Structures are given as C-alpha cells and as structure tokens.
Paper text:
GerQ is a spore coat protein known for its importance in spore germination in B. subtilis and B. cereus. GerQ has been reported to function by recruiting CwlJ, a protein responsible for hydrolyzing the cortex peptidoglycan surrounding dormant spores and essential for Ca2+-DPA induced spore germination. The spores are enveloped by a proteinaceous, self-assembled, multilayered structure known as the spore coat. GerQ assembles into a structurally stable architecture consisting of rings containing nine subunits, which stacks to form filaments.
In this study, we re-process the previous cryo-EM data and successfully determine the structure of these 8 nm filaments at a resolution of 3.3 Å. The GerQ filament exhibits an overall structure characterized by stacked layers, with each layer composed of nine GerQ subunits that form a bowl-like shape. These layers are related to each other by helical symmetry with a rise of 34.2 Å and a twist of −18.4°. Within each layer, the nine GerQ subunits are related to each other with C9 point group symmetry. The filament core in a single GerQ subunit contains residues 91-169. It comprises two α-helixes, five β-strands, and connecting loops that link these secondary structures. The bowl-like structure formed by the nine subunits features a wide opening (∼39 Å) on one side and a narrow opening (~17 Å) on the other side. Each interface is formed by two adjacent GerQ subunits, where β-strands from both GerQ subunits create a continuous antiparallel β-sheet. The subunit-to-subunit interface is further stabilized by hydrophobic interactions and π-π stackings. In contrast to the tightly packed bowl-like structure, the interactions between two adjacent layers in the GerQ filament are relatively weak.
Residue numbers in the entry:
A (entry chain J), B (entry chain H), C (entry chain G), D (entry chain F), E (entry chain E), F (entry chain D), ...: 91 to 169
Write the structure that this text describes.
Amino acid sequence: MLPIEESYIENILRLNRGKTATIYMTFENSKEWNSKIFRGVIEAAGRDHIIISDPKTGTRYLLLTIYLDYITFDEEIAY
Amino acid sequence: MLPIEESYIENILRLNRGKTATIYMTFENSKEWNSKIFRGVIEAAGRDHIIISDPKTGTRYLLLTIYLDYITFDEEIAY
Amino acid sequence: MLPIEESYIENILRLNRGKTATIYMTFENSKEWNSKIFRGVIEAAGRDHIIISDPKTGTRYLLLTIYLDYITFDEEIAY
Amino acid sequence: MLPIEESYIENILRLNRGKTATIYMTFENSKEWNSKIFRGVIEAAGRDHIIISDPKTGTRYLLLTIYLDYITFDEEIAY
Amino acid sequence: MLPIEESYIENILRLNRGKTATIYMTFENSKEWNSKIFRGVIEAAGRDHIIISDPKTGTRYLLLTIYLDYITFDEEIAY
Amino acid sequence: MLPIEESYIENILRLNRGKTATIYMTFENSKEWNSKIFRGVIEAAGRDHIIISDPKTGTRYLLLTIYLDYITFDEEIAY
Amino acid sequence: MLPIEESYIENILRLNRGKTATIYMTFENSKEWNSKIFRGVIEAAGRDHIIISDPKTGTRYLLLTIYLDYITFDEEIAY
Amino acid sequence: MLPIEESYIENILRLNRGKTATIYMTFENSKEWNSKIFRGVIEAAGRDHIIISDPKTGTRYLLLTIYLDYITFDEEIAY
Amino acid sequence: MLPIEESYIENILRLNRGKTATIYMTFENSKEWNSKIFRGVIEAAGRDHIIISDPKTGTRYLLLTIYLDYITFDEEIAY
Amino acid sequence: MLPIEESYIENILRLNRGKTATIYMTFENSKEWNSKIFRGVIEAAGRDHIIISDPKTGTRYLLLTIYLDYITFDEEIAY
Amino acid sequence: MLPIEESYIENILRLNRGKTATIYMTFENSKEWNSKIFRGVIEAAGRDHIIISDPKTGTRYLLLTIYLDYITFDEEIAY
Amino acid sequence: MLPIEESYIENILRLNRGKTATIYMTFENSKEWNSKIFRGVIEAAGRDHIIISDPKTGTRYLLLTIYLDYITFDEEIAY
Amino acid sequence: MLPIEESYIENILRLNRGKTATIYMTFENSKEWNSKIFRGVIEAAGRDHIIISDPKTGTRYLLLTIYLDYITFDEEIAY
Amino acid sequence: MLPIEESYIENILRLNRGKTATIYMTFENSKEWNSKIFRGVIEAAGRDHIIISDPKTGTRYLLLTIYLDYITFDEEIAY
Amino acid sequence: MLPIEESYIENILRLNRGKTATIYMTFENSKEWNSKIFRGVIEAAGRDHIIISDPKTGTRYLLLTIYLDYITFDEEIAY
Amino acid sequence: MLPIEESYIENILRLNRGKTATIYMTFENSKEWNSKIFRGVIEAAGRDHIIISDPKTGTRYLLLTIYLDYITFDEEIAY
Amino acid sequence: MLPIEESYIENILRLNRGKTATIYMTFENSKEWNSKIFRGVIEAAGRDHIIISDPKTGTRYLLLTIYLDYITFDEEIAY
Amino acid sequence: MLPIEESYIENILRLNRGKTATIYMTFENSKEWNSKIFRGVIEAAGRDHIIISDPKTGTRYLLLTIYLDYITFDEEIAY
C-alpha cells in the first residue's frame, strides 16, 4: 500500500491496470457532451491521461485527468 | 489527537478508515450529476482521493477531494 | 486573549470547543444544497475542518472552512 | 492616530471595540442570504473575523472580513 | 504636488481630508445594494478604507477602497 | 517624444495636462452606471487616477485607470 | 513504454503518428463551433498542436492542445 | 524585418506609423459599446496604447491594446 | 522537422509562410463578431500575430494568436 | 553594563535569565508555522539556542537564534 | 552546565539523550513534506544528525540538523 | 563628531541614547509581521541590538540591526 | 560508538550497511520528481553517495547526499 | 576634486553636506514601504548612513546606504 | 572497494564503465526540459561529465555532473 | 587607448566626461521604478557613481554603477 | 584518453573539434529565449566559449559554457 | 590562435574588432527590457564592456559582459 506522500490519483490508477472501471467525466463548457460516462477496462494511466479500452466495440479512449470527476470501480480498488 | 500543524482533512479521513460516512460532493459544472451523495464505508483516503466502498451493491467509488463539500458521519469522528 | 498576529478564524474556533454554534455555510455551485445551516456543538476545529456534532440526531458533521460564511454563537465567544 | 503604513481595516476595527456598528456584508453566491446586515456592538476584531455581539437577542456573531463590504458606525470612528 | 512614484489613490485621498466628496462605489455581487452613492465629508482615508462622515444624519461610514469606482468632488482636488 | 520603454498610458496622460478629453470608462458589474462618459479637461493624471475637471458644472471627477477603456481627444495627442 | 515521469499527453500523441483518431475538442466561448469532432490521421503532434490530416477531403487541420477534451482511437494506443 | 525574439504586436504597430488601419476592438463588459470599430490613421503606438487619428472628423482616439482584437490594414503590413 | 523542445505553434506558422490557410478564431466576449473565419495567405507570423493577407480584396489582417482556435490548411503542413 | 566589543545578542540574553519574554520568531520557508510567538521565561541562552520555559503548560522550548526576529520583554532589559 | 564557548545546539542535544522531544523540522523546497513533526525519544545526537526513536511504532528516524527549526521538550532541558 | 573611520550605524545609535525614535524595520519572510514600526525611546544600542523602550505601555523591545531599514528621529541626530 | 568529532552522517550510514532504510529525499527544482522516497537496503554509502539496493525489483539506486532530507530506519540505528 | 582611488559614494556625500537632495531608496522585501523618496537636506553622511534632515516637518531621517538606489540633487554636485 | 577518502561520485562512475544506467537529471531553470531521463550505457565519466552512449539511436550524450540528481542502475553497482 | 589590464567600465566613463549619454539602469526589486532611463551629460564618473547632469531641467543625478545595465552614447565613445 | 586530473568539459570539447554537436543550453532568466538548441559543427572551444559554426546558414555562434546544460553528439565522443 | 590558458571571451572579442555581430543579452530583473538584441559592429571590447557601434543610426552602445548571453557572428570568428 502506498505511503501518504505518494498516494495521488495517478499512482492508484496505475496500480489497477486491468480493472473494469466506469469513469464519470465532465467537460466544463460544451453543448453536446457536457457529461460523459466512459465505461471500460483501464489499460494504462499516466499523469495526464487514462487510456480506457472499451471491449464492447474496441474504441480505446484517451481521456484527460483534468476533466475527471470520479471513477466507479466494481471489484476491488488496490491501493 | 493530531496537533494544529497537521490537522488537515486528509489526515482525519485517514484516522477513520472504517466509519460509515455519507459524502456530500458537488461537481462544479454538470448537467446530469451536479450534486452527488456517496454513501458507504471509507476504505482508505489519500491526499487526492477518498476510496468509498458502498457495501449495498459493491461499487467501490474513487472520489476526488477537490470537489468535496462535506462528510456526514454517524458514530464518532476520531480526530 | 490571542495577540494580533495569531488571531485567525481557526484559533478562535479551537478556543471555543463546546459552544452551541450554528454555522451558516454556502457551497458555491450546487442545485440541491446551495446554502446550509449546520446547528450543533463544536467538538474540534482544525485549520481545514470544523467537526460539528449535532446532539439532536447524533450525526457528527465534518465541514470545510473554505465554504464557511459565518458562525452564530449563542452564549459567549471566548477570544 | 495610526500612520500610513499600518492603517488597515483590521487595525481601525480594533481601535473601536465598543462602538455600535452595522456591518453591511454580502456573501458571493447564495440563494437565501445574499446580503446581510449585522447590527450590534463590536466586541473584538482580529485580522480574519469581526466578533459582533448583538445585545437585542444575545447572538454573538462571528463574521469573516473577506465578505465585508462596508461598516456604518453611528457615533465616532476613532482612527 | 506629489511626484509620479507616489501619486496613488490613497495619497491624494489623504491630501484632501475635509472636501465634500460623493463616492460612487459598486459591490460586485449583491441583490439589495449593487451600487451605492456615499455622499459626505472625507474625514480620513488609509490605504484600505475611506472614512466618510455624512453630516446630514451623522452616520460615519467606513468604506473599502477595493470596491471604489470613482469619487466626484465639488470644489478643488488638491494633488 | 517618449522612448519605447516608458511610453505607457499614464506618461502620455501626464504629457497632455490641459487637453479637452472625453474618457469612455466602463465599471465591470453595475446596475445603474455600467458605462460612463466623463467629458472635461484633464487637470492631472497619476498612475492610478485621472483627475478630470469638467468646466460646465465644476465637478472635478477622480477616476480610476483600472476601469478605463479609451480616451477620445479632440485637438492633438502629444506623445 | 514510457516511464511515469514523461508519460504526458504529447509524448503519447507522438508515439502514435499514423493512427486513425477522432479528436473531440471544445472551444470555450463560441456561438458557431462550440464543440468540434476532428476525424482523421494524426500526422505529427508537438506540445502545442496536433496536426490532423483528414484523408477524405485533404484538409490538414492544426488544432491546439489547450482546447483538447479527449481523443478516441480505433486500433491500438501505443504507450 | 524583425527577428523572432522581438516580433511582438507593438513593434509592428510602431513599424507602420501612417497606414490606414481599422482596429476591431471589444470591451469586455459594456452595455453601450460592447464592440467598437476605430477607423483611421495610426499616428503612434506604444506598448499600452494605439493613438489612432481619424481624419474624417479629427478625433484622435487613444485606445488600449489590452482590449484589442484585430487590426485590418488595407495597403501593406511592413513587418 | 523541428525537435520536441521548439515545436510550438508560432514556429510551425513561420515554417509555412505562403500556404492558403483559413484561421477559425473566436473572440471571447463580443456581440457582433463572436466567431470569425479569416481566409487567406499567411504572409508572416510572429509570436503574437499572424499577418494574413487575403488576396480576394487585399485587406491584410493582423490577428492575435491569443484568440486563435484552429487553423485549417489545404495543401501540406510543413513541420 | 557590557562594553561595545562584547555587547552581542547572546550576551544580553544571558544577562536576563529569568525575565518574562515573548520571542517573535519566523522560520523562512514553512507552510504551517511561518511565524511563531514563543511566550515564556528565559531559562538559559547559549550562542545558538534560547531555552524558553513556558510555565503555563510546562513545554520547555529550544529555539534557534538564527531564525530569531525580535524579543519583546515586559519589565527591564538589563544590559 | 556548559560554558559559553561550547554551548551549541549539538552539545545540549547530547546532554539530554533520553528526553521525550518533538522536533519541528522544515525541509526547504518540498511539495509533500514541507513541514514535519518528529515526535519521540532522542537516542543520540551527533553534530549532523538527531537519531529520534519513536516508540509508538519503532521507526528510528535519522534527521539532519541543517533543516531543524525548533525542539519542544516536555520535562526538563538539562543544559 | 565621529571621524570617517568609525562613523557606523551602531556608534551613532549609541551617541543618541534617549532620543524619541521610530524604527522602520522589515523582517524578510513573514506572513503576519512583514513590516514593523517600533516607536519609543532608545535606551541602549549595541552592535547587534537596539533596545527600544516604549513608554506608552512599557514593553522594552529588543530588535536586531540586521533587519533594520531606517530610523526616523524627531529632535536632533547627534553625530 | 563514534566520538563527537567524527559522528557525521556518512560515518553512521557506513556503520549500518545492511539495514532496511527508506530515504526521504527532495530535489530542489523539479516538475516531475520534486520529492522521492527511495526504499531498500543500504549496500554502501560514501561521502557523496548512498547506494540503495531495492530488492523488490533489483534497481540499485545511487543517490546524492546533498539532496538528502531524512532517513527512516526500521530496526536499529547503530551509532 | 577627489582622485580615482577614493571617489566613492560616501566621500562625495560628505563633500556636499547642505545640498537639497531627494534620495530614491528601495527596501528589498516590504509590503508597506517597498520604495521610498526621502526629500530633504543632507546634514551628514558616514559610510553606513545618510542623515537627511527634512525641514518641512523636522523629522531627521537616518537612512542606510545599503538600500540606496540613487540621489537626485538640484543645484550642483561638488565632486 | 574504494576507501572512505576517495569514494566520491565520479570515482564510482569510473568504476562502472559499461553498466546500463538511467540518469535522472534536472536542469534548474528551463521551460522545455526541466527534468530529463538519460537512458543508456556509461562509456566514460570524468569529474565534470558523464558520457552516456544510448545504443537505441546512437546519440552519445555528454551530461554535466552539476545538474545530476540520481543514477538508477539495473545490474550491480561496483564500488 | 587604454591597455587590456585597466580597460574597465569606470575608466572609459572617465575618458568621456562631456558626452551625451542615456544610461539604461534597472533597480533589482522595486514597484515604482523597476527600470529607469537617465538621459543627460556625464559630468564625472568615479568607481561607484556616475554623476549625470540633465540640462533640460537641471537635476544632477547621482547613480550607482552596481545597478547599471548599459549606456547608449550618440557621438563617439573614446576608449 | 585524458587522465582523471584534467578530464574537464573544455578539454573534451577541444578533443572533438569537428563533430556535429547539438548543444542544449538554457539562459537563466529570459522571456524570449529561455532554452536554446544550438545545432552545428564545433569549430573551437576555449574554457569560456564554444564556437559553434552552423553550416546551414553560416552563422558562427559564440556561446558561453556557464549556461551550458548538455551536448548531444551523433557519431563518437573522443575522450 | 590563442593557447588554452588565455582563450577567454574578452580576448576573442578583442581579436575580432570589426565583425558584424548581434549580441543576445539578457538583463536579470527588468520589466521593460528583459532581453535585448544589440546588432552592430564591434569597435572595441575590454574585459568589462563591449563597445558596439550600430551603423544604421549611429548609437554606439556600451554593454556589460556580465549580462552577456551569446554573440552571433555572420562571417568568421577569428580565434
């Protein structure tokens, strides 16, 4: 388990590469996509991106953590 | 009890891992989830996340402290 | 009585642990709780939280001082 | 009378502890209390608070100077 | 007359203590007092306040220069 | 004529003390005076004020350069 | 695969020059193009631009990463 | 032609003193002049002003570059 | 081709002096020109301007890169 | 009284062992204790320390003279 | 008691091996630990280290005196 | 009058023991006392201290000459 | 146990070759690694390096003592 | 006239005791007096002080040459 | 193994010519390369340089030890 | 012409007493005069001062060479 | 190959006169050229300069080693 | 060609008196001239100055080598 001094969002996202996650993300000023729900499998997350790979259709998204609001897992968040 | 110089929000959240908490959180600009009420059991809280594990359905949320507004406990806040 | 150089909000809140206080707090952008009135007994206040313990129902709130607007006491503010 | 280099708002508020003052204060984003008029007797003012003690009902307010707009005295501002 | 390097607003306000001035001031976000016109006699002005003493009723205001918009004199601005 | 390194707004305003100027100024958030047109004779301009002396009625304004938008002269801008 | 300390958005965009990408981008304040969907082939991406070359019509866009919201790939994000 | 390290807006405006220019300028928050079109002859431009001298009526404007949006020339921009 | 450390927007704009470009630009707060489409030939681009020379009518615009949103080329972006 | 050649800070601090002193001390770069006010009774002061013994709670501090700013006595500085 | 010529910080720290001390230490430029409070029992202190042995968990720290700010004892500083 | 070779600050401060002086002093990095104005009667000044004895309240300060900026006398500086 | 005259940091680090240590180190000016936590087994420490050999993955670090802040042991610091 | 080897600032300041001088001085880190303009008559200047005696009000300043920036005379600098 | 008196950084770097090393280096004040990760094979290291020869592309870097922060080896640091 | 061993700044400034010079000087930390342009006639320059005598108004400046940045002559620098 | 006692940066730069080098250099405080990439052929390097002769355009730079950060060769560093 | 022991910057600048040079110089803390580009003909360079004589307008600059960053020649650096 990570200590206090490095338990940031990106480190935990990198500890759970392969967990079915649904990311609730909200882009500040839009008219067509004001709030988005990216469901899929986290393939890899850097400190400015969360590469989500939806297996239903195969579209590997590339989100930006700046607009992230909250990630809902389903099995076990390994911290 | 923590001294004055380190009694921040995250330290107290880390002192009460295992207390039934309902977090009232508000995302700044959304159309679908402007205000959310995350009820559950705090499993672990870093300095940029609060891993809430709802036991009713099993969805382990991963919130962001930036959008936090206030946490309502029910038993005893250990500070 | 505190000198000028350390008479901040949190220090006074820490000098009155146990006074019936009603905190008028306002969250910036919400649709459901735009303004809240947290009534109760101040149990302990750090520099980023005000643990209010309502004795009517037992829900020990944990507010954030950032959103604080003003605290109405009823007996004696000890400064 | 204070010199130029220390004639700030809080210093003058501390020079007039005991003057009937009506503070016109405005909280930025509220729906229920957008503008408030706190009338009473200034008991003590630090650099982040103005402890106003209304003698009509006895509720000793604790305002925040950040939201202050202007203070109307009635007898003599001692500067 | 002040040189260029110290001809700020507060210095001139301090050079004209005793001139009938009408201060047009505007508080950013209010519903009841969005724009105010404080008419009176400038008694003393520091670097964060302008103590205006209306002689019609005797209410010695204490404004904040941050919200100042413009001061209309009537006789002679001594700079 | 001023060099490049000191040709700011206030320096030029100080080079034309005595020119009939109409200052188009706009206060950010007001309900009664959102845009103002101060016509008159520039008596003296510091780095935070433009003392305009209207000769029609004699009211010597004292504007703030922060809210300035643009100054329309009529004879000759001496730079 | 990039380490943690250089896994930014632009580096990954530069690792996938030649992948069919649809960039969902949103310009903050517009009336005609508030949200745009730039579909095409990423030719080259610096740290302030993403040169997308649509092959349907031949218009080689030049976007700005500041307004980027999220990039949807279709085959394989190489990180 | 100016090098890269000093090819700013004001330098070019100073290289074309005497070219018929129409400056499209927009003041942020106004009710009466939200967008203005200053047509005329550029007499001299410092780093915080663009002295435009309309020859049709003789009103020598003095704009502020902060509110500038774009300048439409008609003959030749000398850079 | 430019390296990573100097591949900014202005450098590329300077590498393609002479390419038919249509710049989609948006001024933040306007009522008459909220979004503009400047079509023409890029003559020269500094780090705060993009001198576009429309050959249809001859009006050599002088835009500001701050308000730039995205540039659509038509032939070949040389990076 | 000490001569000129040995009247340093530490010598005088050693001549007044037993005087109620409030030391205003400031640590250069801190986020939690940027300025501290150590009130108490000076028990002994070497050339790199000032052992202050607060009698209110009994915590015998051990400050460092390097960070000292100024000592306020209350009765008589014996030099 | 030590004479004047050798009463430095390290000598006194070596005279009190075994006193419950809380060292308030501040590292100059950090983002995660800008100010630290090392509580424990001083086991041994050289001239460049203060081996603090916390008995609560058993982690024997090894601090550096360069970053020391001030040590708060609780029983008796033997000098 | 002192010769050139010994006319330092401390010597003159020692020649005027008993003159009402207001010392304008500035501590380098503070949040609460960045600039202080110590008014009083100079009782004695060594080469690292200026014992100022305010007679209004009786608090005999002990400043440090390192942080001194300038001393304003009122009657006669004897040099 | 080392005497006073040679009890420096490097000597003690050399007396404990083989103790599980977590070194909290902070590099002065970085954007990606401002604070690092090197956990492992100290293999050998000279006077300008601390060869830490993490056994989890096998990466034998080579730190620099200049940037060291503090070393947390876990079993016994032999001095 | 002084030779090259002793024509320092203090020597010239001592050659012009009695010349109306305005000293432009700047204290490094202040919030209230960042730049000061001491106007008056130079009474005597040592090698660490410039005793300026303003005759308008009678306050005989005592500046420090370390913070000096430049002295503007008005009649004749005798060197 | 080197003795204590010559176990510096450069000597050890010279004892491991031919070990795959990743040097984490940070240049103090840059906008484009604030932190760099030079991965490769150490060919030779003097006392002011570390000639790293990346075999992936063949670019033989020449770093400066002054900016070095820490070197991560992978096989065996021979000291 | 001076040899190599004595061709310093002050010697050349002393060889051109009487040349119209504009000294571009910059004081390190100021809010009102961060950069100054002293235009005039060099009357005499020692090794710590440059007595510039502006003939337009008669104010004989006395600059300090420490803050000098560069001197622009107009006729002939005699070296 | 140079021995240990003279293997400095300048000696090696002088051993490779004629190797295509790209010098990554960073000037401490600039607004226009904060980081520069000088690509070319090293013609000659003294102990305070590196005469780089770019053959693309013919501009023979003359850098300063003080601001050097790191030199990337491409063929063979001869040490 | 100069030997190693005297190949400094000033010696080479003195070997090329008469070469068209553009000196890129940067003054540390300025608001108006943070970076300057002095183009011209080097007339003579001592060890603390570089007398550049621009022939376009005739202003013979006198720079200071301390602020020098790098000199770009155009024909041949004779070393």
